[PDB]
Amino acid sequence: RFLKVKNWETDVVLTDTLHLKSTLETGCTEHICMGSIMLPSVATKDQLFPLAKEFLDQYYSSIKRFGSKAHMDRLEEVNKEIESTSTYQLKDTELIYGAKHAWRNASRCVGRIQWSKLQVFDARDCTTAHGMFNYICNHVKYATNKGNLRSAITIFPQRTDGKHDFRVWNSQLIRYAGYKQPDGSTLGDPANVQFTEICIQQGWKAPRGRFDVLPLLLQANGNDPELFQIPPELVLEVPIRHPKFDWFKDLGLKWYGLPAVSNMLLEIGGLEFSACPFSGWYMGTEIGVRDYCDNSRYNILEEVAKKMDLDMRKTSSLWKDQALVEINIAVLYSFQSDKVTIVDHHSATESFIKHMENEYRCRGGCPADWVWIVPPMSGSITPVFHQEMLNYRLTPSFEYQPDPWNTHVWK
Amino acid sequence: RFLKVKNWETDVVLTDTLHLKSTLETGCTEHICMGSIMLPSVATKDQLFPLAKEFLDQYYSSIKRFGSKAHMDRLEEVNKEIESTSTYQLKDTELIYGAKHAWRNASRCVGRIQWSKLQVFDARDCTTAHGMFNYICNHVKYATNKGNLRSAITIFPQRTDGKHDFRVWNSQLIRYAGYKQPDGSTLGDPANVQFTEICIQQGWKAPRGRFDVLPLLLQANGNDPELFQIPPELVLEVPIRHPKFDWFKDLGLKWYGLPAVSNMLLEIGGLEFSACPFSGWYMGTEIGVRDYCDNSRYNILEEVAKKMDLDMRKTSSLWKDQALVEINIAVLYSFQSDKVTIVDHHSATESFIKHMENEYRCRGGCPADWVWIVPPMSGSITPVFHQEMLNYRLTPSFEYQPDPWNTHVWK
Ligand code: HEM
Ligand code: HEM
Ligand SMILES: CN(C)CCc1cc(F)c(F)c(CCc2cc(C(F)F)cc(N)n2)c1
Ligand SMILES: CN(C)CCc1cc(F)c(F)c(CCc2cc(C(F)F)cc(N)n2)c1
Ligand SMILES: C[C@H](O)[C@H](O)[C@H]1CNc2nc(N)[nH]c(=O)c2N1
Ligand SMILES: C[C@H](O)[C@H](O)[C@H]1CNc2nc(N)[nH]c(=O)c2N1
Ligand SMILES: [Zn+2]
DSSP, X not given: OOEEEEBTTTOOEEEEOGGGGOOSOOXXXXXXXOTTOSSOOOOOHHHHHHHHHHHXXXXXXXXXXXXXXXXXXXXXXHHHHHHHHSSOOOOHHHHHHHHHHHHHTOTTOTTGGGTTSOEEEEOTTOOSHHHHHHHHHHHHHHHXXXXXXXXXXXXXXXXXXXXXXXXXXXXXXXXXXXXXXXXXXXXXXXXXXXXXXXXXXXXXXXXXXXXXXXXXXXXXXXXXXXXXXXXXXXXXXXXXXXXXXXXXXXXXXXXXXXXXXXXXXEEETTEEESOOOEEOOEEHHIIIIIIHHOTTTTOOHHHHHHHHTOOOSOSTTOHHHHHHHHHHHHHHHHHHHTTOOEEOHHHHHHHHHHHHHHHHHHHSOOOOOHHHHSOSSSGGGSTTTTBOOOBOOOSSEEEOOOOHHHHOXXX | OOEEEEBTTTOOEEEXXXXXXXXXXOSOOSSOBOTTOSSOOOOOHHHHHHHHHHHHHHHHHHTXXXXXXXXXXXXXXXXXXXXXXSSOOOOHHHXXXXXXXXXXXXXXXXXXXXXXXXXXXXXXXXXXXXXXXXXXXXXXXXXXXXXXXXXXXXXXXXOSSSSSOOEEOSSBSSOBOEEEOTTSOEEEOGGGHHHHHHHHHTTOOOOOSSSXXXXXXXXXXXXXXXXXXXXXXXXXXXXXXXXXXXXXXXGOOEEESOOEEOSOXXXXXXXXXXXXOEEOOEEHHIIIIIIHHOTTTTOXXXXXXXXXXXXXXXXXXXXXXXXXXXXXXXXXXXXXXXXXXXXXXHHHHHHHHHHHHHHHHHHSOOOOOHHHHSOSSSGGGSTTTTBOOOBOOOSSEEEOOOOHHHHOOOO
């Protein structure tokens, strides 16, 4: 019941007891492991109070005030409010604690060594999509910090009934558009082709090019979502050049500095925050490997290998691999030269092992999803490849949610 | 109960019903996924007959003779023999069927597209370590086929009581020795340092160099294991050169052509075969990435990067990654130029997806362990990265077993 995980590079053994506190379910059974399924799968007042009590019990235990009167009263105070309202409201300090621990508990996130330094923006007084725009703009400006990126999250009002939901319809705050061509090909980011068409459907005048920063599509309190263009001065972008190959600039590649996921759901003491955009900084491989070299994304291995003069006839020339390393040297070099925060998969994975050691000592474990933690290139020359990881679901948490354009009853 | 797995590169969906036939347990629960734990964890006559019946029921169903008289008699015949002997003996055709399906069911094996073309050598009449040597020698010669490698397995007598076990103490038939130095460093393969010392303890005159092919250490019917040197003409080796870098030959690297695991246990209808060395051919990354570049193995990224003239000061120069690709181009190129069978991770992973499609149609699924299937470099530019895989344990199977030098009551 007190499980051991081993590092097979260093022979370090850590003991996990935190998984005992785990509540949610993983999708796996004794007879089938679903560790590689990508997206495994109202709320009544009866369900709400154990979840609030559970959350408050760990909140007061963390500020070294577990079981005191100020605890019990808050416990009673929330009990009474759930009786009277069939929901309840977090104190500001509980919101900050909750959001930081949703990130701390995100088993697929390799960046969690920084989980305690998260800037929480309370947008729970917001009522209009224009207000969301204003908040998201302030978030972007703050998080970007002129390239000295800072972790942040902005938390819009919690779900109530379920038909009054705040949603950022964008999957990320800053994403490049994707347009299907007449000849079937795709310009820009193929991932966003559908969302790009939703913005056009709502009146976005697309500059039909490569790296067109999409507009924000914001839904307030269940209403129809509204388009807003982020002031370009707030969208920090990095032109991608190589420290050796001067033809690399002529590729005309660039990326945005700020990774900021906006489609996920934050759960805190049973309260659901449907719009909670959060941002950090990139690990290079997210751009260099997946964004640029996924077959169904920008898919630039072809052109980079052509310009590298590579034996592209055979599979075993490893021309794909060789061009992949150059592309990731270039992403990292471009970001660093522009003083835009970025971490390489070697630095980030070493930090995660050091993070894991901290969490096993002062917390009893660290839920971790190996499938997502190991980088998409050079896996085994990073320390996380050789690290056994227990995956389990703790709360507060970030959860997936349906895309709003399947759920939303339009007008 | 009829689960779906998706490919996120191609949007192909397959439906798994084979997991219903699964019997063993995975280590995961509804509350904790152990998909990244490396080694998760006598036999009575009551337990034996359901396992025999289960196996025979699928054997006759596969030669299109399920439930016939020849089935029922074999069923009765094995029932009677388990009553009378508290164990039983497989027909030759059942041994071949069993061994092929142990490989077919090996969820961590990416090479399984070839599972039906396995050459099974029945060594169940063997009685002495000298006899094992003779059989293993014939296996090596056959499997090597002068570089045109052929899949094979040699099956020594099944376990009976448990103190009369046949064991190949070697983890693989052909492995390089590893010697700890006076200054603490390691010459050769650090993985084998302990086993290398066991061979010296038993009288092996080590040529204390790099790539010293270890001797076979063979235990027959529970007796003390005996040393045998494989005739060097049977050990096919590949000197590693690069198609560009002529200094690469001066690295003095080489590897053996034949991967042949010898420490695992084959389970067929409840019968345990403790010595069942099996061989195929290498995927390049096994050598180029793990053998050569694991920190706790040969660990040659340092020297290769030095000779490549690489910015080794910073982590984010990706000098490790860049040297890793060159090393794997070289392994592949050297093997192919010598006409020694080898597959690149691009060819092998594409074959495994094609293998998966075959198994989902004509079998209802394919147990697969993503953590092991995805190659240790360039993961996401291979199709298996984007393939959801269900892992579950089917039988016949290859299982891990304790190393014999912890179990063996010596003389
Ligand atoms: C500070 C720098 C950060 C880095 C370097 C980082 C890195 C990563 C990476 C590489 C992934 C893999 C998922 C993918 O490849 O798309 C990931 C996932 C994730 N990140 Fe982090 N991240 C950072 C900050 C944050 C912050 C501030 C939050 C929340 C406040 C967060 C929440 C998450 C979540 C919830 C996931 C998992 C999504 C899922 O469950 O599928 N990250 N991160
Ligand atoms: C024919 C060419 C073959 C190729 C290219 C191949 C490739 C691989 C690779 C890359 C692994 C990953 C494990 C590691 O990295 O050490 C593996 C595992 C494995 N292979 Fe295959 N293999 C082949 C043939 C065979 C054969 C003939 C058998 C049995 C008769 C077999 C049985 C296994 C088993 C049981 C494992 C998993 C060990 C475990 O459960 O941890 N393989 N294979
Ligand atoms: C399969 N795809 C669609 C999953 C989508 C997806 C969902 C997530 F929750 C998620 F975090 C990511 C990583 C991007 C990312 C986010 C952050 C954070 F600060 F915002 C930092 C960072 N470095 N990278 C991707
Ligand atoms: C963590 N380590 C110690 C696990 C050891 C280990 C156990 C195994 F069963 C296993 F198959 C391997 C792969 C080697 C291999 C084997 C074969 C086959 F034909 F023999 C073919 C191939 N290409 N590669 C490694
Ligand atoms: C099929 C598989 O689950 C899927 O491709 C996963 C694999 N691991 C990943 N890991 C990260 N970090 N990001 C991803 O999108 C994925 N995709
Ligand atoms: C911790 C982790 O389970 C371990 O390092 C695994 C990861 N995946 C692997 N995959 C393969 N093919 N071979 C391995 O040895 C490993 N090692
Ligand atoms: Zn699992």
